[PDB]
């Protein structure tokens, strides 16, 4: 692909492996799940899954069943013994294909309990089921009290019939990226209660797990049998409040770069881009970076996004357009085709994804995950 | 059946009859001009090839893309689009596939000497002449050639390449900065500069088939800016360029995309229960919550946290707290739709659902960004092909 000449997202799989390594050291009591949903947070699902497994991940996590099934179908195959879990299900989804593919499937509700049991019955092989507990996030889990009682009950019956085995009990935190937030302790308490209850009724899960990246990095009591450090595996800190990648032995995996399309002199008083929200203060040079919001450069970073060009940080001049944006180069005259580095690990003087997050009023998770399909991915150290 | 399966979670429904109607409506609105169907960025999220075909059927005689790869993909479509449709691309960088573009008969934009040298080199090596459009920077300060010496030199090099039989300048074009703000003084200033820079080029000897400057908001509001060709991108997808310009209905337009999902969970929760990351929403009393299985990886902007609208079970709901990567929650106020019930995030608006403009407002952006960044994990379903 000559598509890389315009722009590319370089994915350093050696950095990803080092991150997995570092996260395994940080959670020595637990298995590590490589969360590779959303096309591995924009980094490429299958290449990142292989690298994570090579570095010691024994679980893969996806949102949709289609994502998990694509991992099972990869050629050459990932090891047959890697566990693959998926959790974002709707009525009528491919439960039977998931059971036949030996996926761990999350169940938060009776409807899904019924459908997976029906699918196991029709497939003639038992399902592996994880029960999700809503411990305080108020999102995908089963509520405590009657809902949980009923769900645990139906799971035991299906076990009795040989239709499934409950392989895990899990939940997810709301505010683990704010250390000391009182909801963290409240959720852990509730997690302990709800899991104690399920085990006393007779469930025998292989894994209990609640930890995402910020809990993995800051709460050893929340590690249990399995940690799910998604954003950290891609070398990106969950928040500045938690710390920098370097604080945890982490290195950003993605570098986003483009080649300048145009370098041109313009007079003072010349408007730049839509709405003319920037006006040259005097005679100067403008550089055209051929990436825009269709490529995942957030429109919210208009006037603020940083980019390394020709030895200095520049910032976006005025509005980001669909396919491009402009920087004021202050008189410098790099060649057309010169490298513009939007973000990376930061060790060459370039910005990081967290700098973009700040410029766009969002979090670094969104920045890396929404880099568009029009930007080719280049895998290094595969 | 694998098709039938991903649509169960969510889908972006693309009504090509609405797109064809929009192209007809735009052609009425610019009777002096050919219409270019701007299908860059995967047709603003709607699907490049299906939209290109529909637009051509409805009378578009030009297709516009940003990258050469987009344009080459249109040339290569099977079945082919008509051989006589013109396909233009404009976002080039040094060393791009100029020769392949020349051999594929694309119109290629040039704003600079580097590019003039590369395309002339490629035409020389291919042994076939290039079709080149010169872009003028009339005030936008983005991709065009500046007036004065830069333009003089570019027009000069183009004439020499014409003299050698290496290319023909097929167009002279530009693009507006503020056409979405009617009466903004930059509009007239750019048109005046466009007229001068194009007059200059023609008097030096260039004979373009088309002159063009109009995007959607100019096409809709500025008949003097139509020239020989209009490029109404967002309007073709039935979306107004701004509320200042008007609503789609004001222009005989209908939104082409409908974004919908199937509820993944409906559950009862007590009062005082936090909802989603950071607990920016707390249930005020006992209630029901609905889980919509779409998140910012699917293109639901995180900026619409606490504000995005969605039609569920007969009423508009709004996002409760933070939108997550793969899902968000709504407070259903006690209602108990079935799991799997339809949640309509946006569409043309005639069934009581929100529009892409409502999402733009909720997310502090423009409707262009909403439709364009709907993620590849959302399948597109084409109706009225
Ligand atoms: C159920 C589940 N487990 C673990 C993770 C890993 O989170 P970290 O990436 O924070 O480690 C996530 C993803 N969290 C994303 C981030 O945005 N919204 C989500 O659902 C998730 O949804
Ligand atoms: C060169 C060019 N021509 C025509 C159009 C059509 O514009 P409308 O969609 O506004 O009709 C665009 C789209 N402009 C996109 C829209 O956002 N940013 C851009 O550069 C464009 O870049
Ligand atoms: Cl939850
Ligand atoms: Cl701005
Ligand atoms: Cl310009
Ligand atoms: Na929870
Ligand atoms: Na211009």
UniProtKB/Swiss-Prot annotation, chain B:
Annotated residues that bind substrate are located at 142, 325
Where along the chain is the active site annotated?
Answer: 40, 277
Q: Which keywords fit this entry according to its UniProt record?
A: Isomerase, Pyridoxal phosphate
Q: Pathway, per Swiss-Prot/TrEMBL?
A: Amino-acid biosynthesis; D-alanine biosynthesis; D-alanine from L-alanine: step 1/1
- Residues annotated with N6-(pyridoxal phosphate)lysine modification: 40
Q: Which GO terms describe its biological process?
A: D-alanine biosynthetic process; peptidoglycan biosynthetic process
Which EC number(s) does UniProt give?
Answer: 5.1.1.1
SUPFAM superfamilies from the UniProt entry: Alanine racemase C-terminal domain-like, PLP-binding barrel
| Keyword Nucleotidyltransferase in record | no
Q: What InterPro entries does this protein's entry cite? A: Ala_racemase, Ala_racemase/Decarboxylase_C, Ala_racemase_C, Ala_racemase_N, Ala_racemase_pyridoxalP-BS, PLP-binding_barrel
Q: Which Gene3D superfamilies match?
A: Alanine racemase, Lyase, Ornithine Decarboxylase, Chain A, domain 1
Q: Supply the PROSITE patterns for this chain.
A: ALANINE_RACEMASE (PS00395)
The record's annotation in NCBIfam families points to: alr
Give the similarity note. Belongs to the alanine racemase family.
Function recorded in the entry: Catalyzes the interconversion of L-alanine and D-alanine. May also act on other amino acids.
Q: Which PANTHER family does this one have?
A: ALANINE RACEMASE, ALANINE RACEMASE, CATABOLIC-RELATED
Please state what the protein is called: Alanine racemase
């Amino acid at each position: 692909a000559d598509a890389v000449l315009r722009a590319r997202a370089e994915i350093d799989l050696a950095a990803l492996r080092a991150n997995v390594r570092a996260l395994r050291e940080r959670a020595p009591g637990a298995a590590l799940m490589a969360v590779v949903k959303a096309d591995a947070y924009g980094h490429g699902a299958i290449p990142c899954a292989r690298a994570a497994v090579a570095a010691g991940a024994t679980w893969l996590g996806t949102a949709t069943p289609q994502e998990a099934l694509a991992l099972r179908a990869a050629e050459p195959g990932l090891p047959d013994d890697v566990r693959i879990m998926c959790w974002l299900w709707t009525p009528g989804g491919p439960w039977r294909e998931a059971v036949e593919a030996r996926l761990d499937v999350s169940v938060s509700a009776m409807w899904a309990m019924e459908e997976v049991t029906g699918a196991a019955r029709a497939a003639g092989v038992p399902a592996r089921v994880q029960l999700k507990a809503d411990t305080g996030l108020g999102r995908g889990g089963c509520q405590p009290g009657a809902d949980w009682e009923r769900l645990v009950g139906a799971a035991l019956r299906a076990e009795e019939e040989g239709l499934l085995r409950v392989t895990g009990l899990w939940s997810h935190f709301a505010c683990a990226d704010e250390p000391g937030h009182p909801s963290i302790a409240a959720q852990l308490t509730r997690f302990r209660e709800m899991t104690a209850y399920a085990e006393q009724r007779g469930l025998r899960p292989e894994v209990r797990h609640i930890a995402n990246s910020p809990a993995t990095l800051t709460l050893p009591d929340a590690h249990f049998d399995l940690v799910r450090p998604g954003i950290a595996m891609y070398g990106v800190s969950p928040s500045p409040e938690i710390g920098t990648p370097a604080d945890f032995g982490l290195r950003p995996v993605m570098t986003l770069a483009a080649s300048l399309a145009l370098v041109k002199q313009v007079p003072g008083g010349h408007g730049v881009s839509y709405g003319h929200h920037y006006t040259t203060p005097g005679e100067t040079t403008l550089g055209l970076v051929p990436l825009g919001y269709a490529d995942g450069i957030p429109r919210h970073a208009s006037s603020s996004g940083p980019v390394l060009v020709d030895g200095k940080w520049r910032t976006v001049a005025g509005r980001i357009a669909m396919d491009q944006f402009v920087v004021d180069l202050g008189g410098d005259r790099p060649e057309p085709g010169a490298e513009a580095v939007l973000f990376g690990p930061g060790d060459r003087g370039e910005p990081t994804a967290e700098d973009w997050a700040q410029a766009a009023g969002t979090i670094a998770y969104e920045i890396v995950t929404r880099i568009g399909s029009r930007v080719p991915r280049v895998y290094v150290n595969e």
